[PDB]
Amino acid sequence: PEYVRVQRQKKILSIRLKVPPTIAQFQYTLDRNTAAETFKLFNKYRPETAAEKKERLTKEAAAVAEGKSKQDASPKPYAVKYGLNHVVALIENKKAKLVLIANDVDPIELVVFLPALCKKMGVPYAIVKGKARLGTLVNQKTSAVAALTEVRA
Amino acid sequence: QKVKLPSGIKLDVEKKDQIPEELLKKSTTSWSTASVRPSTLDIEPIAVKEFTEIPHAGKSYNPNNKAWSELINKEYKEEKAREDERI
Amino acid sequence: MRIKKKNTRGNARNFITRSQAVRKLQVSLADFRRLCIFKGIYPREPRNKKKANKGSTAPTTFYYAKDIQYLMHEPVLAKFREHKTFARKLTRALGRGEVSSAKRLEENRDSYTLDHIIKERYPSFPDAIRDIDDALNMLFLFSNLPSTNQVSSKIINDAQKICNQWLAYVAKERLVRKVFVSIKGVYYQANIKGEEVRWLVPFKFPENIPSDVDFRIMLTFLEFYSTLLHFVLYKLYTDSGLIYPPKLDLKKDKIISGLSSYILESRKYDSPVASLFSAFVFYVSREVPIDILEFLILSCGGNVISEAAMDQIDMSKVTHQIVDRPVLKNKVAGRTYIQPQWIFDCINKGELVPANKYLPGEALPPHLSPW
C-alpha cells in the first residue's frame, strides 16, 4: 500500500542523505544496560494516577476539617516532571538533576535545542531510546521528555 | 420493569399494558431482533448409531452365568469378524 | 421472470457450510462451536448433497440457514465481543504496568450467563425434567476426575456442590426406586414429579484422562448443564419446601465431605420404598464404599454410622453391620451381619428380603438388573 511504501522510503531517504550534525546526535543513545538501570530509578517515582488522586481528595476532607491543617498533614509528593514546557522551565533555574529526551518525535525541531540547552546550563542530560517508554513511566501514551528534580534520602 | 423492543432500545416502564401492542410487534428500526423461535430448532438431532443407555446386566458385578456368558458370546462374534478381516 | 440461475434456490438456500456460518457470524471457530451448544444448533444431512454444495461430493457439516439467522442476534454473542475488548484492554494495563488499573479492570466486568437461553429452550418444568437425565451423568463424571490444565479446580468444585445438592434433595424427599450396581459405577432411578430419571455415579477411583477427548467442547456442555440444574434445584428445593441454596457445616465437611454435610431446612411419603429401614440403624464398616451406601440408607429413611468417619475423631442403638471381609472377628450377639448386596437387592423389590441369606463369608444369590 502507498502508506507502507512511503514510510519505508522515508526511512531510506534519511540514511542516504548527509544529515546535519545537530540532528543525528540522536540515534547515538543510551545503551540497553544503562537504560535498564535508569528505568528502575524512574518507576519508583511514578506520578500519582487519576484513581489515586480521587482517593487522596476524600482522605484529606476527613482529616483536615475535623482537627487541623491546610492539607499539610499529607506528605510531600516526589514524582517525575513530564511536560516539555515545564521541564525547559525547570532547566535554567536550574533545578533538574536528570533529563531524559526521547530520540524520536515527529516535529524533531521540538527537541533539537534541548541537548545544546542542557549543555549550556550544565544539566546532566541523556537521550533514552523511544518516546513510548517515557510515556509508560509517566502514565501517558508518549512523553517526549521526562525530568526528575527531587529524590528520597 | 424494563422491556427490550425488536429495535433493542432499552427502556424502563411500569405496567406492561402501558406500552402499545403495535410497537413491540412491528419494526421501527431496520435491524429488528427476533421474537419468534424457528420451527427448525425444535426438531431433534439425527440418530447416528443406536446408543442403548440401559446396561446389559451381564455387566453387573456378581452376574448370573446365563447372562454373563451371553455378554461374552455376542462380542466374541464382533471381535472374531475383525480378527478374520485382520488375518 | 427471466431464467433464474441454479445454486440460489432450494437445498442451496436451506443449508450453509460451517465455513460460511463462521464467516457470516464473524465470530471465529473456537467461539462458534460454543454458541452452537448453547442454542443449540445441531448439524444436518441434506438429502441431495450435490445440489447443496454446488456440487462437491465432499465431507462437510451443514446447519440450516434459519438456525444461524436466529443465532446471529442473541445477547450472549455481544458478551463474547465485550470479553474480546476486555482482554485487549487488560494486556495494555499489564504491558504498561500499571498493575492496579488491571486489578480494577478485573473487578469491573460482567460475565455472560445463560438464563434466558435455558428458559426459552426448556419452557418449562416437565420439559426440563425430561432432559435433566442427560445433565446428571456428566456432572457426576466431572465431579470425580482430578484437576489439571484443560479443566482447573473451580469447574470441578462447582460440579461437586451441584451434585451433592441433588443427592441431598433425593435423600431428604426419598425418591430411589431402582438401584443397579455395575462394573461401570452405579446406576440409580428416581421419580422426580412424574417422569423417571436414570443417572450414573462412577466409583470414586483415581482415573483417568486419555488426552484424545476434546474438553473445549465438553466444558461448554458442562457450563450449560450446570446452569440448567441450578434452575431445577432452585424450583425443587422451594416447592418441597426448603431454603435454596442450602448452607453446609464445615466441621462435618472435614470428616467425610459428602452427603451428611449440607443441612436442609424449612420455608408421610409416596411409599413403599421410602420407610424401608425405619427404626433401623446401620454401622457400615471401613472396607465398604461409604459413598454408595449412606445415600441409599438415608434415601430409604434410616440412620448410618461409618467407621471411615472415626479416624478424624457409641454402638448403643446399632442393629445392622454392613461388612465384606473374608474372615470377621469377634461379632456381637444382638447385632445382625450382612453384605451390601442385601441393600441393593432389598430396594429393587421393595419387600425386605431375609438376612439368613447373604452374610460373610458366604456366597451370594446373583444380583439382576430391574430392566
Add this chain to the structure above:
Amino acid sequence: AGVKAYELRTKSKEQLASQLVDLKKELAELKVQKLSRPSLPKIKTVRKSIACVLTVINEQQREAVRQLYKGKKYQPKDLRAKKTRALRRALTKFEASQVTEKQRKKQIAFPQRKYAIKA
C-alpha cells in the same frame, strides 16, 4: 352525520379497529350504488368518518409513544420539535449565557450601576 371524535377517544384500540373495517365495508357498498346513480350524498360522511377514526387511532398511539420515550436524551425525529432549520442549529440558552471565568468576575466587581442626574 357519522362519528364524533370525543366519543372515539373513550373507546379502546380493538374497538376502533372494528369501527374502521365496518366503515370500509360500508364505503365499498356505497361505491356500487354510485356508478348506477348520478349522485349519492351519504358517501361524503362515511369517508370523513374513516378519516376521523384513523386520526384518533394515530393520536392514541403517538401520545403513548411520547410517554415511554419521556425523560431521556435522543428521541425519534418526528417527535422532536420542528421549529425551523436555522433555529434547530445555533446556540441554546446554556451555550450562550455561558461566559468565560474572567468575564464572570468582572461583572460581579463592576456591573452596570443605576444612577440619575439631579440630586
Add this chain to the structure above:
Amino acid sequence: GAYKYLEELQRKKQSDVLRFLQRVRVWEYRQKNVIHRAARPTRPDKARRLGYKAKQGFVIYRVRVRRGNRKRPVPKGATYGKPTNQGVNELKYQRSLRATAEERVGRRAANLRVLNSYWVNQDSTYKYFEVILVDPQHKAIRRDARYNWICDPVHKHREARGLTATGKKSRGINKGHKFNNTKAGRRKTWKRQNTLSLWRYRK
C-alpha cells in the same frame, strides 16, 4: 517554554539543520494526496499563536497548490478585442495562493469552518500550506465562550468572502491615507462616492 527556542529556530530557514528538514519533508508531502489530513501540527508554536488549541474539534489539514501566474482560459491564445489585453500568461490573480489553499479545504471539509492558515514548505511547482479548521457542531467548542462565536452563522465560509488574515490583506483593509480606495469595502466606497444625493429642499 518551547516558545522562544522554536520561534527563533524556525526563522533561520537557510540554516543547515532546517533546510535538511525542508528537503526531507517536501518529498514526503509530494507522495501523499493534494489535500490530506495531518495528525498534528508540523509547527506547534505557529498554530498555537494563530489560535489552534489541542482539544477535540480542532483540525489541521495539509494542502498543496500550484505556483505561478493565472492563465486566461480564452481558446487558441486568441484575444478578440484590443491589444491592451496583451500577453496571456502575465495575468496575476488578486487573491494569494495561501487564500486559494483555504478555499479548497473549505470545500472538501464543509462541516468545519476555516479559522486560519500557516505556510510550511515550497518547491518550484508547488507551495504547501497547513490549514487550521474548527468544528462548531462539537460540544467542547460550543460550550466555553472563547470559541462559541465561530458557531454563529455569520461565519459560514470565512475564506470564500475573504475575512481570514490572508483575505483581509488581499482586499487591502487597514487604517490610513494609503488605504483610501479600499477600507470599508472597495465596491462600497465606489458606490458611495459615485451616487447623486438629492434632498427634498435642494441644496
Add this chain to the structure above:
RNA sequence: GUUUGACCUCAAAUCAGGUAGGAGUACCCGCUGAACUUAAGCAUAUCAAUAAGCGGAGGAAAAGAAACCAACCGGGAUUGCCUUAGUAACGGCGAGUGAAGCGGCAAAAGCUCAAAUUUGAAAUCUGGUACCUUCGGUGCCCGAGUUGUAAUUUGGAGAGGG
C-alpha cells in the same frame, strides 16, 4: 524472545451521534471581466475597477478599539449625513478623471488570545451509562490531553515578593 507487548502512522464498518449540498439573491462580501459609446477617424485614454459569468452570508452585511490623523494650546475604534470640493492630484495636463485631514451632526461600547512552571498534585473537556428539579444537573465508567487542557496576564498595562 523465531515470543509477547508498548507507541506511531494509515485504514475499514448499513459502527454511536452529528453536519454540508439546493432554493431565494433588492440590499451585502469576494473573484472574474467586455464591448458599444465619448475623444477626429484611434493603438494611451473614456465607457468601467461597470454589464454578463462564478463563489459566499445575514436581517442587515462589511467595517471596528490604531504599526491612525497630524505638525495644533494637538486630536483619539468603526459607519453614515452636511461640508471640505469640482479643491489637491492625474491626463495626446486633450476629451475628461478626482480624493482625504480638520469642522458641525446621527449613533456611541468595549475587549480576547499567542508569549511568562499550577508542578504541593490536568486544578480542564467530549462521550457512554444509572438516577434527577431536563435549552440542563449529580455519580460511576470508557477516552481526549503534558508535542499542553484550565486558572492568573494583553501593553491603557501587568506579575511575584514586602
Add this chain to the structure above:
RNA sequence: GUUCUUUGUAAAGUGCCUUCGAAGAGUCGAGUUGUUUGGGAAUGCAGCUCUAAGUGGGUGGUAAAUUCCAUCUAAAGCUAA
C-alpha cells in the same frame, strides 16, 4: 413591590516600596513583472527572486546620504447602534 436562602477570615478593587515587564517571519522590507489608483517615480494588490531586527520596527503623500524630532506598535481574534 413581596418571599426564601444567606456566601465569605471566600472573590474583586485601592496606596507605597522592590526585582522582574515575555509582545505574532518565506513575514516586514527590497528588486522586477502584471494590474489598480487622484496618488504624481510608483496608492494598493498579486506572481516570481532575494529576505531582516529588538534601546527594535512602521509611518511622516519628492529622489538619496548624514543627524534629529514627532507619532503609533504590524505580520492572530471577537464585538451592538
Add this chain to the structure above:
RNA sequence: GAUGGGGAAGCUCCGUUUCAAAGGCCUGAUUUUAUGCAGGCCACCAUCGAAAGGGAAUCCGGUUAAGAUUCCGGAACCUGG
C-alpha cells in the same frame, strides 16, 4: 459515463482500468497457554448504450358494435424448485 486520482479563481474539465488497502472462496480439538483468529486459495474492475444485431418456450379452431399467437375449448412446450 461515475469511482480512485489529477487539473481549474470557479460553473466544472480530463480519464475508464488508469500510479487505489477497489472482495469472496476453502480448511481448521492448526494443541495447548486452557474465555481474544490461525493456516491458505483466487486474480479484472461501476453503470448506461439496439421495440430492426444477439436472444428459453404456443399452435389450431371458436368468439366481439369495437379485442386477441394475450379471452374461450382443446392440444403443446420452457425455466426454476
